[PDB]
A paper describes a structure:
Cyclosporin A (CsA) is a cyclic undecapeptide fungal metabolite that is used for the prevention of acute rejection in solid-organ transplantation and in the treatment of psoriasis. CsA binds to CypA and this heterodimeric complex binds to and inhibits calcineurin, inducing immunosuppression. Here, we report the X-ray crystal structures of the CsA analogues E-­ISA247 (voclosporin) and Z-ISA247 bound to CypA. In both complexes, the structure of CypA, the backbone con­formation of the ISA247 isomers and the nonsubstituted ISA247 side chains 2–11 are essentially the same as in the structure of the CypA–CsA complex.
The structures of CypA complexed with E-ISA247 and Z-­ISA247 were determined at 2.2 and 2.3 Å resolution, respectively, with excellent quality of the electron density. We conclude that the chemical modifications of the ISA247 isomers at residue 1 do not induce major re­arrangements of the CypA side chains in the drug–CypA complex and that functional differences between the two ISA247 isomers result from the structural difference at the modified MePmt1 residue only. We have determined the binding affinities of E-ISA247, Z-­ISA247 and CsA to its pharmacological binding partner CypA using fluorescence spectroscopy. This is reflected in the distances of the CypA Ala103 carbonyl groups to the MeBmt1 (4.0 Å), E-MePmt1 (3.5 Å) and Z-MePmt (5.0 Å) CZ atoms in the respective structures. We suggest that lack of surface complementarity between CypA and Z-MePmt is the reason for the reduced affinity of the CsA analogue Z-­ISA247.
Residue numbers in the entry:
A (entry chain A): 1 to 165
B (entry chain B): 1 to 11
Write the structure that this text describes.
Amino acid sequence: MVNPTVFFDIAVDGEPLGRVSFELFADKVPKTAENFRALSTGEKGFGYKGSCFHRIIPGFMCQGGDFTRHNGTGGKSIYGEKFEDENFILKHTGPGILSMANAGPNTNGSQFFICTAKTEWLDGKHVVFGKVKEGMNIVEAMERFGSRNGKTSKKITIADCGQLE
Amino acid sequence: XLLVXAGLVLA
């Protein structure tokens, strides 16, 4: 199977910023990739469209995916409230890595993070499932609205999202 | 510290 590609159209306080696209490594983690892909298209009736990045820490990562509570307490997977860590084949190699947020072993929902650095200390605890293809400069622009404690100075939103192929 | 958690954010 060819690895799927998804896009996010990012807005700052409602104003278009740019497009970010991701390669999803379905050849390593098909269950995790599929979940992100489906929440990106909205085909299940719910997903990332209109959600925000509630937690951005400069030099570290941008966290999003909480489309039910918008603060880190919510979100759900296409498989149910949670699913297992599929595997840890892939590592946090550097900027652009797309990886699952969680609340301990086997608690994957819909929350994810895009790294803006190598985050090796997270290897084996967070399932890496993708990487930024185009629009790393958009991610870098998003990053600048974050702070040390994660709070954003402006509303960073996924105005639109879906699948390219 | 620098974690990416969902609910109880730790140091």
